[PDB]
């Protein structure tokens, strides 16, 4: 459960992402494909080369969804509804993979907003990313 302190922190760090959100999503992706090559099994149709347009483009999609989750941290299920359906009924990404991407987002953030990535903020972001994965995997069965 995201406590009031968590929401505060998540809203603080994400606020410091701003216009770079699309870039961080794209960095998170490259990190994941490289660190966990099994994840590439879901993007056979992508060009996975460094700086591919498909990757960059996709990085922003994910980024925007996260921002939307943050703006709606209090009503996550209803905000991510359509995406929950999407992943559960079409994409069918195995739940374990959400943990891999979540990690790469943390790394990306850590390497970009050093002052803000304090231990407690680190804790908050991890809880938040866990909540979002939980929301996207809730309609699986």
Partner 1 sequence: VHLTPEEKSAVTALWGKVNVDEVGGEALGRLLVVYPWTQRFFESFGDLSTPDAVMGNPKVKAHGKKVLGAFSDGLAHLDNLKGTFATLSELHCDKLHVDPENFRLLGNVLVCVLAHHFGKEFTPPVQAAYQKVVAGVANALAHKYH
Residues forming contacts to ligand HEM in the complex (CB under 6 A) are 39, 42-43, 58, 61-62, 65-66, 83, 86-87, 91, 93, 97-98, 101, 132-133, 136
DSSP state of 45: T
On the CB side of 53, how many CA atoms lie within 13 Å of its CA? Answer: 0
List the one residue out of 40, 18, 41 whose CA is nearest residue 31.
40
Judged by beta carbon distances under 5 to 8 A according to partner kind, the member of a second copy, partner 1, ligand HEM, none in contact with residue 14 is none
Return the residue of 17, 127, 128, 129 that touches a second copy, per CB under 8 A. 127
Q: Does position 138 bind a second copy by CB under 8 A?
A: yes
Sign of CA dihedral 48, 53, 59, 62: negative
Q: Does position 92 bind partner 1 by CB under 8 A?
A: yes
Sign of CA dihedral 59, 28, 139, 8: negative
Number of chain positions touching partner 1 (CB under 8 A)? 36
Q: Does position 93 bind partner 1 by CB under 8 A?
A: yes
Judged by beta carbon distances under 5 to 8 A according to partner kind, the member of a second copy, ligand HEM, partner 1, none in contact with residue 133 is ligand HEM
Read off φ and ψ for residue 36, nearest 5 degrees. -130, 80
Q: Of 22-81, which residues contact partner 1 (CB under 8 A)?
A: 27, 30-31, 34-39, 41-42, 44
Tokens encoding 58: 């996709």
């Amino acid at each position: 459960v995201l406590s009031p302190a968590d929401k505060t922190n998540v809203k603080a760090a994400w606020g410091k992402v701003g216009a770079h959100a699309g870039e961080y999503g794209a960095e998170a992706l490259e990190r994941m494909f490289l660190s966990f090559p099994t994840t590439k099994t879901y993007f056979p149709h992508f060009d996975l080369s460094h700086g591919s347009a498909q990757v960059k483009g996709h990085g922003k999609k994910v980024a925007d969804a996260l921002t939307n989750a943050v703006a709606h941290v209090d009503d996550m299920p209803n905000a991510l509804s359509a995406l929950s359906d999407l992943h559960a009924h079409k994409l069918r990404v195995d739940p374990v993979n959400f943990k891999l991407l979540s990690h790469c987002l943390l790394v990306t953030l850590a390497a970009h907003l050093p002052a803000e990535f304090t231990p407690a903020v680190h804790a908050s972001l991890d809880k938040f990313l866990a909540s979002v994965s939980t929301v996207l995997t809730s309609k699986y069965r």
